[PDB]
Design a protein around this motif. Structure first.
Motif, PDB file in Angstrom:
ATOM      1  N   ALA A   1     -11.103  -9.086  47.662  1.00 32.22           N
ATOM      2  CA  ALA A   1     -10.248  -8.705  46.554  1.00 32.22           C
ATOM      3  C   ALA A   1      -9.312  -7.560  46.920  1.00 32.22           C
ATOM      4  CB  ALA A   1     -11.110  -8.291  45.353  1.00 32.22           C
ATOM      5  N   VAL A   2      -8.304  -7.357  46.084  1.00 28.52           N
ATOM      6  CA  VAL A   2      -7.347  -6.267  46.251  1.00 28.52           C
ATOM      7  C   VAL A   2      -7.311  -5.470  44.930  1.00 28.52           C
ATOM      8  CG1 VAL A   2      -4.985  -5.649  46.725  1.00 28.52           C
ATOM      9  CG2 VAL A   2      -5.933  -7.586  47.912  1.00 28.52           C
ATOM     10  N   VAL A   3      -7.508  -4.152  44.972  1.00 37.38           N
ATOM     11  CA  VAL A   3      -7.478  -3.347  43.740  1.00 37.38           C
ATOM     12  C   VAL A   3      -6.214  -2.486  43.697  1.00 37.38           C
ATOM     13  CG1 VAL A   3      -8.617  -1.550  42.382  1.00 37.38           C
ATOM     14  CG2 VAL A   3      -9.939  -3.226  43.601  1.00 37.38           C
ATOM     15  N   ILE A   4      -5.365  -2.697  42.700  1.00 37.01           N
ATOM     16  CA  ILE A   4      -4.127  -1.940  42.635  1.00 37.01           C
ATOM     17  C   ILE A   4      -3.966  -1.086  41.401  1.00 37.01           C
ATOM     18  CG2 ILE A   4      -1.677  -2.121  42.558  1.00 37.01           C
ATOM     19  CD1 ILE A   4      -1.929  -4.594  44.304  1.00 37.01           C
ATOM     20  N   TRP A   5      -3.691   0.205  41.615  1.00 35.92           N
ATOM     21  CA  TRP A   5      -3.498   1.109  40.490  1.00 35.92           C
ATOM     22  C   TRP A   5      -2.176   1.866  40.349  1.00 35.92           C
ATOM     23  CZ3 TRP A   5      -5.267   6.417  38.705  1.00 35.92           C
ATOM     24  CH2 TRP A   5      -5.024   6.515  37.303  1.00 35.92           C
ATOM     25  N   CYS A   6      -1.275   1.320  39.523  1.00 35.59           N
ATOM     26  CA  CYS A   6       0.038   1.917  39.274  1.00 35.59           C
ATOM     27  C   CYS A   6       0.180   2.291  37.804  1.00 35.59           C
ATOM     28  CB  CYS A   6       1.126   0.920  39.644  1.00 35.59           C
ATOM     29  SG  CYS A   6       2.759   1.652  39.997  1.00 35.59           S
TER      30      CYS A   6
ATOM     31  N   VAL B   1       2.894   0.749  35.101  1.00 36.58           N
ATOM     32  CA  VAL B   1       2.797  -0.583  34.449  1.00 36.58           C
ATOM     33  C   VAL B   1       2.228  -0.547  33.023  1.00 36.58           C
ATOM     34  CG1 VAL B   1       1.747  -2.877  34.627  1.00 36.58           C
ATOM     35  CG2 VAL B   1       2.428  -1.711  36.659  1.00 36.58           C
ATOM     36  N   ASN B   2       2.998  -1.070  32.066  1.00 38.13           N
ATOM     37  CA  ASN B   2       2.601  -1.101  30.662  1.00 38.13           C
ATOM     38  C   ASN B   2       2.526  -2.530  30.124  1.00 38.13           C
ATOM     39  OD1 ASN B   2       3.444  -1.220  27.598  1.00 38.13           O
ATOM     40  ND2 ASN B   2       2.571   0.837  27.911  1.00 38.13           N
ATOM     41  N   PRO B   3       1.315  -3.014  29.833  1.00 42.25           N
ATOM     42  CA  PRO B   3       1.044  -4.353  29.304  1.00 42.25           C
ATOM     43  C   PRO B   3       1.751  -4.685  27.980  1.00 42.25           C
ATOM     44  CG  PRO B   3      -0.969  -3.307  30.027  1.00 42.25           C
ATOM     45  CD  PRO B   3       0.071  -2.242  29.898  1.00 42.25           C
ATOM     46  N   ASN B   4       1.969  -3.694  27.127  1.00 44.42           N
ATOM     47  CA  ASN B   4       2.616  -3.943  25.840  1.00 44.42           C
ATOM     48  C   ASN B   4       4.092  -4.329  25.914  1.00 44.42           C
ATOM     49  OD1 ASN B   4       0.157  -3.377  24.635  1.00 44.42           O
ATOM     50  ND2 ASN B   4       0.715  -1.285  24.066  1.00 44.42           N
ATOM     51  N   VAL B   5       4.770  -3.933  26.992  1.00 40.78           N
ATOM     52  CA  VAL B   5       6.200  -4.253  27.152  1.00 40.78           C
ATOM     53  C   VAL B   5       6.545  -5.169  28.336  1.00 40.78           C
ATOM     54  CG1 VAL B   5       7.084  -2.242  25.923  1.00 40.78           C
ATOM     55  CG2 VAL B   5       6.485  -2.067  28.403  1.00 40.78           C
ATOM     56  N   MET B   6       5.584  -5.384  29.232  1.00 39.72           N
ATOM     57  CA  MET B   6       5.791  -6.241  30.407  1.00 39.72           C
ATOM     58  C   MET B   6       5.042  -7.587  30.256  1.00 39.72           C
ATOM     59  SD  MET B   6       5.460  -3.354  33.484  1.00 39.72           S
ATOM     60  CE  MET B   6       6.670  -2.015  33.753  1.00 39.72           C
ATOM     61  N   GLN B   7       5.770  -8.693  30.369  1.00 47.41           N
ATOM     62  CA  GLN B   7       5.161 -10.016  30.240  1.00 47.41           C
ATOM     63  C   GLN B   7       4.318 -10.382  31.463  1.00 47.41           C
ATOM     64  OE1 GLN B   7       5.641 -10.176  26.864  1.00 47.41           O
ATOM     65  NE2 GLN B   7       5.831 -12.395  27.153  1.00 47.41           N
ATOM     66  N   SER B   8       4.810 -10.005  32.637  1.00 47.98           N
ATOM     67  CA  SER B   8       4.157 -10.290  33.914  1.00 47.98           C
ATOM     68  C   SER B   8       4.651  -9.368  35.042  1.00 47.98           C
ATOM     69  CB  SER B   8       4.408 -11.757  34.304  1.00 47.98           C
ATOM     70  OG  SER B   8       5.774 -12.010  34.601  1.00 47.98           O
ATOM     71  N   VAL B   9       3.867  -9.256  36.108  1.00 52.56           N
ATOM     72  CA  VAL B   9       4.261  -8.462  37.269  1.00 52.56           C
ATOM     73  C   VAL B   9       4.076  -9.318  38.515  1.00 52.56           C
ATOM     74  CG1 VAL B   9       3.674  -6.197  36.315  1.00 52.56           C
ATOM     75  CG2 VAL B   9       1.939  -7.484  37.631  1.00 52.56           C
ATOM     76  N   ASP B  10       4.531  -8.798  39.644  1.00 55.23           N
ATOM     77  CA  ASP B  10       4.407  -9.515  40.902  1.00 55.23           C
ATOM     78  C   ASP B  10       3.978  -8.589  42.007  1.00 55.23           C
ATOM     79  OD1 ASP B  10       5.107 -11.936  39.749  1.00 55.23           O
ATOM     80  OD2 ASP B  10       7.229 -11.807  40.311  1.00 55.23           O
ATOM     81  N   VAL B  11       3.254  -9.134  42.990  1.00 50.81           N
ATOM     82  CA  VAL B  11       2.776  -8.363  44.141  1.00 50.81           C
ATOM     83  C   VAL B  11       3.277  -8.943  45.466  1.00 50.81           C
ATOM     84  CG1 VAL B  11       0.735  -7.458  42.957  1.00 50.81           C
ATOM     85  CG2 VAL B  11       0.558  -9.599  44.234  1.00 50.81           C
ATOM     86  N   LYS B  12       3.601  -8.064  46.405  1.00 57.63           N
ATOM     87  CA  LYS B  12       4.110  -8.493  47.697  1.00 57.63           C
ATOM     88  C   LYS B  12       3.365  -7.798  48.820  1.00 57.63           C
ATOM     89  CE  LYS B  12       8.405  -8.629  50.475  1.00 57.63           C
ATOM     90  NZ  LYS B  12       9.823  -8.177  50.496  1.00 57.63           N
TER      91      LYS B  12
END
Lengths: 51, 50
Positions: B13-18, B21-32
């Motif tokens: 697994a990969v654990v990412i902490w930023c 990022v706000n779930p209430n205003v963002m529909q989706s995110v992406d990782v590279k």
């Protein structure tokens, strides 16, 4: 006895010059710098701009 | 802290902490991910509650 003395001095002269050629030739070699080959292009993480 | 991380056979697994990022205003995110050899890989993660 002219020829005998003449020949001797001539032999010594040619030997000295040959040894000098060697030092000069070998020093001439291994005296080339050259270059490095730049790595593969850098991947672009982002391109952006601000005011 | 090390500059490079490596993995082997089987799951991981990969654990990412930023904090940005706000779930209430963002529909989706992406990782590279950027490999040591320079190639890249990307995945898609929905954030919406449901």
């Amino acid at each position: 006895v002219s020829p005998v003395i003449a020949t001797l001095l001539l032999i010594l002269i040619a030997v000295a010059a040959a040894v000098l050629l060697y030092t000069w030739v070998s020093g001439l070699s291994a005296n080339v710098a050259g270059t490095q080959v730049t790595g593969k292009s850098l991947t672009l993480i982002q391109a952006t701009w601000a005011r | 802290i090390f500059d490079v991380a490596s993995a082997s056979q089987s799951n991981f697994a990969v654990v990412i902490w930023c904090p940005n990022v706000n779930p209430n205003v963002m529909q989706s995110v992406d990782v590279k991910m950027v490999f040591s050899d320079g190639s890249t890989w990307e995945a898609s993660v929905p954030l919406s509650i449901t």
